[PDB]
């Protein structure tokens, strides 16, 4: 056996729900997706991008930031707040975000001022990597 049913969503959302050989999580801390036998866990999935391979499908990559998870015997499922997928309508208009976020990482206003913004920067460009590889899709 090498497939299971997964269901990732973020409040009224339908990113991936159906058969699934394995997904993929890429965040600062964590580098595994999901498979038929990932033990009964239920913590967070960390931010970053995500890749997957449907049992009868080819492969797709979504993208999240913060959320919890819950796997069951035969199908996993998790919930999150922001869930964007390689696309988000606009594409090159998001590249200017990493530039407007610098003015914040360059301004000092405390020990955790822009320092805490560094986590919202490296996690925002996570959706730019999966969306940049969608140029060869069409």
Swiss-Prot record:
Classification via SUPFAM superfamilies: Epsilon subunit of F1F0-ATP synthase C-terminal domain, Epsilon subunit of F1F0-ATP synthase N-terminal domain
GO terms for biological process, alphabetical: proton motive force-driven ATP synthesis; proton motive force-driven plasma membrane ATP synthesis
Similarity remark: Belongs to the ATPase epsilon chain family.
Complexes and interactors: F-type ATPases have 2 components, CF(1) - the catalytic core - and CF(0) - the membrane proton channel. CF(1) has five subunits: alpha(3), beta(3), gamma(1), delta(1), epsilon(1). CF(0) has three main subunits: a, b and c.
Organismal lineage: Bacteria, Pseudomonadati, Pseudomonadota, Gammaproteobacteria, Enterobacterales
Protein name: ATP synthase epsilon chain
Cited CDD domains: F1-ATPase_delta
Organism: Escherichia coli (strain K12)
Gene field: atpC
GO MF, any single term: proton-transporting ATP synthase activity, rotational mechanism
Membrane topology field: Peripheral membrane protein
Keyword Protein transport recorded: no
Superkingdom per UniProt: Bacteria
Main location: membrane
């Amino acid at each position: 056996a090498m497939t299971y049913h997964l269901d990732v969503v973020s409040a009224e959302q339908q990113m991936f729900s159906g058969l699934v050989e394995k997904i993929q999580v890429t965040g600062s801390e964590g580098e595994l997706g999901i498979y038929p036998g990932h033990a009964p866990l239920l913590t967070a999935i960390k931010p970053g991008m995500i890749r997957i391979v449907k049992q009868h499908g080819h492969e797709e990559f979504i993208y999240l930031s913060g959320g919890i998870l819950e796997v069951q015997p035969g199908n996993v499922t998790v919930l999150a707040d922001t869930a964007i997928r390689g696309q988000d309508l606009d594409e090159a208009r998001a590249m200017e975000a990493k530039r407007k976020a610098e003015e914040h990482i360059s301004s000092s206003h405390g020990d955790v001022d822009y320092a805490q913004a560094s986590a919202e920067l490296a996690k925002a460009i996570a959706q730019l990597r999966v969306i940049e590889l969608t140029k060869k899709a069409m």
